[PDB]
Structure formats: structure tokens, C-alpha cells
Amino acid sequence: FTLIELMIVVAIIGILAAIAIPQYQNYVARSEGASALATINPLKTTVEESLSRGIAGSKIKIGTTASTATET
Amino acid sequence: DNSVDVRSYPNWERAAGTRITGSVRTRGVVESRASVRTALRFNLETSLAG
């Protein structure tokens, strides 16, 4: 081993240790909103169906408790 | 003899068509009879001849 190789390696290390990094927060901030609406939009179909069929409001809830001929 | 069903306002199964809930049976027997009354009056007359 010599000093030339070691110095060249040290210089190349510092050279590589200079890559810039741009922002990456707005991407996730927008992806979260693009998914929230896509997930909570389809409920309007069920709401309109329940309001136009015959049953009144209030009884319309969320979860997984089966269904019947009165509550949705 | 006769039978009648019982049903309250829409209930059971959360339906809305008035379902049956009970029943009430009625029995009995008819009877007929006739009667004829008759009352005759008579006057008594006693004496003691000698």
C-alpha cells in the first residue's frame, strides 16, 4: 500500500459524499389525501340508495353488523 | 268451534308488513229446548146432608 491510493480513495469518498437530496414530503401529503377521498366517496351511493328506497335517516350507520329491511 | 289470529303493529325481524304473533281459539256448543205449561183451575164444593 502507498499514500497515492489512500489519498485518491479519501478524495473519491468526499466526492461521492456530495449528492443532493430534494424534498419528499408533499408527495406523501398528497397521496394521503388522494386515498382518503377515494375511500370515503363511495358511501354516497349507499346514502342515496337508503334515502330513496324508503327507510329514514339516523338508522344509517357504519360497521359490520349485517343488514335487514329497516336499518342499513 | 272457531279460531282467530293475533297480530300487533309491525314488529319482529325489523319488518314492516304486520306479522302474526299469536292466536286465540274459541269453542262451545248450542242447545235448544221447548216447554209447554198448563194450569187448570177447579172450585171445590163440600156439604154434609142428613
UniProtKB/Swiss-Prot annotation, chain A:
**Would you tell me the protein name for this molecule?**
Type IV major pilin protein PilA
Please give the annotated consequence of changing residue 5 to A. Decrease in methylation of F-1 and loss of pili assembly
Taxonomic source organism: Pseudomonas aeruginosa (strain ATCC 15692 / DSM 22644 / CIP 104116 / JCM 14847 / LMG 12228 / 1C / PRS 101 / PAO1)
Which residue ranges does UniProt annotate as crossing the membrane?
1-21
How does the annotation summarize its subunit structure? Answer: Interacts with itself to form a multimeric tubular filament structure with a diameter of 51 Angstroms. Interacts with PilJ. Interacts with PilS at the inner membrane. Interacts with type II secretion system (T2SS) components XcpT, XcpU and XcpW. (Microbial infection) The ssRNA phage PP7 infects P.aeruginosa O1 (PAO1) through the retractile type IV pilus (T4P). PP7 binds to T4P by interacting with a single pilin subunit PilA through the Pilus-Interacting Region (PIR) of the phage maturation protein (Mat), and is brought to the cell surface through pilus retraction powered by ATPases PilT and PilU. Then Mat enters the cell envelope, causing pilus bending and pilus detachment, which impairs cell motility and restricts the pathogen's virulence.
Q: Which family does it belong to?
A: Belongs to the N-Me-Phe pilin family.
Biological role: Major component of the type IV pilus (T4P) that plays a role in surface and host cell adhesion, colonization, biofilm maturation, virulence, and twitching, a form of surface-associated motility facilitated by cycles of extension, adhesion, and retraction of T4P fibers. In addition, plays a critical role in type II secretion of exoenzymes by interacting with specific components such as XcpT or XcpU. Modulates host calcium signaling through interaction with host calcium-modulating cyclophilin ligand.
Q: Which residues carry this modification: N-methylphenylalanine?
A: 1
Q: Which domain of life is it from?
A: Bacteria
Quote the subcellular location field of this record.
Fimbrium; Cell inner membrane; Host endoplasmic reticulum membrane
- Domain description: PilA subunits constituting the T4P exhibit a classical pilin fold featuring an extended N-terminal alpha-helix linked to a C-terminal globular beta-sheet-containing domain, which are packed tightly along the pilus. The N-terminal helices constitute the pilus core where they stabilize the tubular assembly via hydrophobic interactions. The alpha-helical core of the pilus is surrounded by the C-terminal globular domain of PilA that coats the outer surface of the pilus, mediating interactions with the surrounding environment.
Q: What happens when the gene is disrupted?
A: Mutants show a significant reduction in the efficiency of extracellular protein secretion. They are also defective in twitching motility.
Mutation: residue 1 to C; reported impact is:
Loss of processing by PilD
PTM field: Methylated by prepilin peptidase PilD at the amino group of the N-terminal phenylalanine once the leader sequence is cleaved.
Q: Which residues of the full protein are shown?
A: 7 to 78 of 149
UniProtKB/Swiss-Prot annotation, chain B:
Q: Which residues cross the membrane?
A: none
Q: Which residues form the signal peptide?
A: none
- Where in the cell? Virion
Superkingdom is Viruses
Q: List the disulfide bonds.
A: none
Assembly and binders: Interacts with the host pilus.
- Function of the molecule: The maturation protein is required for the typical attachment of the phage to the side of the bacterial F-pili. Binds to sequences located toward each end of the genome, hence circularizing it. The RNA genome-maturation protein A complex is released from the capsid upon host receptor binding. Maturation protein A enters the cell along with the viral RNA.
Q: Which family does it belong to?
A: Belongs to the Leviviricetes maturation protein family.
List the protein's name: Maturation protein A
